[PDB]
Design a protein around this motif. Structure first.
Motif, PDB file in Angstrom:
ATOM      1  N   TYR E 214       1.105  -3.793   2.088  1.00  0.00           N
ATOM      2  CA  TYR E 214       1.844  -3.211   0.799  1.00  0.00           C
ATOM      3  C   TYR E 214       1.683  -1.696   0.292  1.00  0.00           C
ATOM      4  CZ  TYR E 214       2.781  -8.118  -0.195  1.00  0.00           C
ATOM      5  OH  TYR E 214       3.117  -9.595  -0.267  1.00  0.00           O
ATOM      6  N   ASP E 215       1.870  -1.062   1.395  1.00  0.00           N
ATOM      7  CA  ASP E 215       1.829   0.418   1.437  1.00  0.00           C
ATOM      8  C   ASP E 215       2.873   1.100   0.587  1.00  0.00           C
ATOM      9  OD1 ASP E 215       1.984   3.308   2.219  1.00  0.00           O
ATOM     10  OD2 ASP E 215       0.280   2.912   3.830  1.00  0.00           O
ATOM     11  N   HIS E 216       3.994   0.413   0.878  1.00  0.00           N
ATOM     12  CA  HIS E 216       5.340   1.236   0.179  1.00  0.00           C
ATOM     13  C   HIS E 216       5.430   0.963  -1.240  1.00  0.00           C
ATOM     14  CE1 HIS E 216       6.219  -2.539   1.920  1.00  0.00           C
ATOM     15  NE2 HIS E 216       7.129  -2.953   1.200  1.00  0.00           N
ATOM     16  N   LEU E 217       4.757   0.106  -1.739  1.00  0.00           N
ATOM     17  CA  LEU E 217       5.080  -0.280  -3.164  1.00  0.00           C
ATOM     18  C   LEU E 217       4.279   0.660  -3.978  1.00  0.00           C
ATOM     19  CD1 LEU E 217       6.502  -2.874  -3.521  1.00  0.00           C
ATOM     20  CD2 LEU E 217       4.897  -3.078  -1.396  1.00  0.00           C
ATOM     21  N   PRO E 218       5.069   1.336  -4.940  1.00  0.00           N
ATOM     22  CA  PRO E 218       4.290   2.453  -5.941  1.00  0.00           C
ATOM     23  C   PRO E 218       3.163   1.743  -6.687  1.00  0.00           C
ATOM     24  CG  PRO E 218       6.370   1.165  -6.625  1.00  0.00           C
ATOM     25  CD  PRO E 218       6.366   0.807  -5.451  1.00  0.00           C
ATOM     26  N   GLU E 219       2.037   2.744  -6.740  1.00  0.00           N
ATOM     27  CA  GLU E 219       0.962   2.233  -7.211  1.00  0.00           C
ATOM     28  C   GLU E 219       0.930   1.767  -8.927  1.00  0.00           C
ATOM     29  OE1 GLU E 219      -1.216   5.956  -7.127  1.00  0.00           O
ATOM     30  OE2 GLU E 219       0.214   7.381  -8.232  1.00  0.00           O
TER      31      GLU E 219
END
Lengths: 123, 240, 167, 121, 238
Positions: E214-219
């Motif tokens: 889940y790297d691409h999901l915004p924080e």
């Protein structure tokens, strides 16, 4: 003379760390560095021997007005040491006037005296 | 111990030395004694009369008309806090102060004496001579320049330094190891026999090092020796 | 906290040494330049702030639109093919040093251009003599890189000094 | 071996503050940093997992002599595990010599054992 | 209250849940009357017998062969100083410890649990399993690395970081946000229903976060969330 001495001393002291790494800045900065080196070498004294005020004002006159800039940094201390006794022997009139009135001697007279001393000084 | 040393100074005449284990532990013993007696603490809990007690100790260690007492005292500096009352108060009685740094000790440099933080009252030409003072000052300047160049040599390569900077670091490592000497007592720890170096031979060796006479010897030759002749002998031993 | 402030002070001293070295090297570089006065010219060592970032992002956009070791590392991480690399390069290059590289390239360059006080800007040139213009571009790039490193390192020094003032 | 280990750690503590620039540092500085990283991985141990003295000596010898500079850092622990079993399989003479004489065994045989294990790894 | 719970533990042998919303006030009230009783001040003006008085109470709160007592005590920290004599003396009486940080609370991270300074005796490979221990230790290492990198980021910047450090900062921000969750009791404070996350779901989510799934999901999607799929559900709202 204290004002000019303060100006050059503060100008050099602010930036001495720049010089030590080499590849100096603009020619004005190089002149500031040389003048500050002369200043710090002049203000260094030899322990328990004080210097009379009449001698102090004239050595600082020699320093500030662009005369020690032709002398190597290490040799300005010996230049001061020889300047003191040269003034004691052959420059008694400037020192006497300083003692009497507490103001600088006639500009041309002290200028020619120190120029002659610089001519006879052995660097 | 001071009473024994003072008898030996007076009634025997010849110079007498007094070594004290740790001044810090004497100041803390005094502080604990004062706290037990009930006096109000000063500074960091120390005794109010700390300066008086340290003076009363260190003022009897003096050279008189009958003789002299040299004193060597070790001082523990807690947490590298030189502003602690015990070391700061000791500083006001010491003609010479030698700083022992753990960083050098971890590098093998012994006695781990800090070259730049070590100060002496008698490091002037009038006491040790012009040659001795000049050599000591030149060594101090070279070590200071090396310390300044540490960061640049760590980040940039040695190639980035000028020829003079290369020379100053080249000599500075040699001096840095050369200040370490094999200890007569370290034969207990490392087994190697120690050495005794006269002051004249010390200054001769450091002058020879500063003159560039031995820039071709690898630094490990200067690691732990007595004389620069021993440096040459060790360099021969490694097969150089 | 004592260890933290000491480490930050040491980092500040390291940055001060780096920026003084950068100032001296920039003086030498622009003295050499004024004595004298696809392809991408980028530095070897980083620490130049946004000096490398601007050129890399702009060349990325221009390659993606028109064409549809900190320099080559970007391309490798972008997974792109390149023909010639001159990664390691002297600070003061002799004409013969980069002459051969120019000959093989010439057998469209992007570089920084020097305006002092954080004013270096990216520049383009379409070509196809030319080796001289590549030399001028490389010298300009080296001068701009030294200036950018000095500015960025001075900024880092002020950031460290602000942190040590807050602490 | 502990003297050399202390020297390595003293050198490594002189370059931690420069690791912030560690991507573009000097070759010697990079080598010292890598050796320090391998060392701090070697010294890592788990709870209730004592290690016999001979195997400690052998792993420190392997670390200091530079046999670990080729393997990746994150594998060091695994190395320190498997190598130990390797010893209990083949290097029993070395361990017995260390336990008896309380001194390092012949160094060329130790190097040969290390090379054999590195081939096995 | 301890007597009331202790009768149930001893004379009935039933499992007990003993909640104490501020055990620090017992120490504080003992300190209030310390001077008037006739006892010389200790450090920071506390009682000379702070430790003994606290131990004579905290040692009664314990499980016995007759029955277990799960005890949860909230401990107030004066002036946000964990080195205060009362919390410091209390730290040696507890199996699990949760440290609540004002800095995390100010950032919107609730329950504002300090992910590093809070440790429990149960975090062992043989008690919670190897996977749970591995993921918890990796999360803590990543957060400590981010905390140490924060000074370099402040001084040098973000671009000067290496690629590994950039990934560490990315995943550390993601983890620190994902460690927060919407509370049931937060309804009146948020208008949002609470969530209950099974330990398996927590471990799976954090193992997937560390892996880079889940790297691409915004924080932003990782704040005040339940399970890991709720994160992607929140992300669909952007």
């Amino acid at each position: 003379v204290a004002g000019t001495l303060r100006l050059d001393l503060a100008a050099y002291r602010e930036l001495e760390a720049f010089a030590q790494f080499g590849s100096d800045l603009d020619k004005a900065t190089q002149a500031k560095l040389a003048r500050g080196a002369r200043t710090v070498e002049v203000l260094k004294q030899d322990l328990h021997q004080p210097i009379p005020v009449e001698k102090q004002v004239l050595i600082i006159y020699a320093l500030t007005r662009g005369f020690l800039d032709d002398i190597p940094v290490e040799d300005v201390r010996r230049f001061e040491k020889e300047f003191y006794l040269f003034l004691d022997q052959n420059g008694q009139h400037l020192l006497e006037h300083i003692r009497t009135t507490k103001d600088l001697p006639n500009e041309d007279d002290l200028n020619k005296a120190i120029e002659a001393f610089k001519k006879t000084f052995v660097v | 111990g001071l009473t024994m040393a003072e008898y030996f100074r007076d009634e025997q005449g010849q110079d007498v030395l007094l070594f004290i284990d740790n001044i810090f532990r004497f100041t803390q013993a005094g502080s604990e004694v004062s706290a037990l007696l009930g006096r109000m603490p000063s500074a960091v809990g120390y005794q109010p009369t700390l300066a008086t007690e340290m003076g009363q100790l260190q003022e009897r260690i003096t050279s008189t008309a009958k003789g002299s007492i040299t004193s060597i005292q070790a001082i523990y500096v807690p947490a590298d806090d030189y502003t602690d009352p015990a070391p700061a108060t000791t500083f006001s009685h010491l003609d010479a102060t030698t700083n022992l740094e753990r960083k050098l000790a971890e590098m093998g440099i012994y006695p781990a004496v800090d070259p730049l933080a070590s100060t002496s009252r008698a490091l002037a030409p009038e006491i040790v001579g012009e040659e001795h003072y000049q050599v000591a000052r030149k060594v101090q300047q070279t070590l200071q320049r090396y310390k300044e160049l540490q960061d640049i040599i760590a980040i940039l390569g040695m190639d980035e330094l000028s020829d003079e900077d290369k020379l100053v670091v080249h000599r500075a490592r040699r001096i840095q190891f050369f200040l370490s000497q094999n200890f007569h007592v370290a034969e207990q720890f490392t087994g190697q026999p120690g050495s005794y170096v006269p002051v004249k031979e010390t200054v001769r060796g450091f002058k020879e090092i500063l003159e560039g006479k031995y820039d071709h010897l690898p630094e490990d030759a200067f690691r732990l020796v007595g004389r620069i002749e021993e440096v040459v002998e060790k360099a021969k031993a490694m097969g150089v | 906290i004592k260890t933290r402030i000491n480490a930050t002070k040491k980092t500040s001293q390291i940055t001060k040494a780096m920026e003084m070295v950068s100032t001296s090297k920039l003086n030498r570089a622009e003295q050499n330049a004024k004595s004298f006065v696809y392809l991408v010219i980028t530095s070897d060592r980083g620490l130049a702030g946004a000096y490398n970032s601007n050129v890399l992002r702009l060349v990325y956009q221009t390659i993606q639109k028109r064409h549809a070791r900190v320099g080559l590392s970007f391309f490798r991480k972008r997974n792109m093919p390149v023909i010639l690399d001159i990664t390691r390069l002297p600070d003061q290059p002799s004409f013969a040093d980069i002459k051969e590289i120019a000959r093989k390239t010439v057998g469209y360059m992007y570089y920084n251009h020097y305006v002092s006080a954080i004013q270096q800007e990216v520049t383009e040139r379409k070509l196809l003599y030319a080796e001289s213009l590549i030399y001028g571009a490389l010298l300009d790039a080296k001068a701009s890189e030294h200036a950018a490193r000095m500015t960025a390192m001075k900024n880092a020094t002020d950031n460290a000094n602000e942190l040590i003032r807050t602490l």
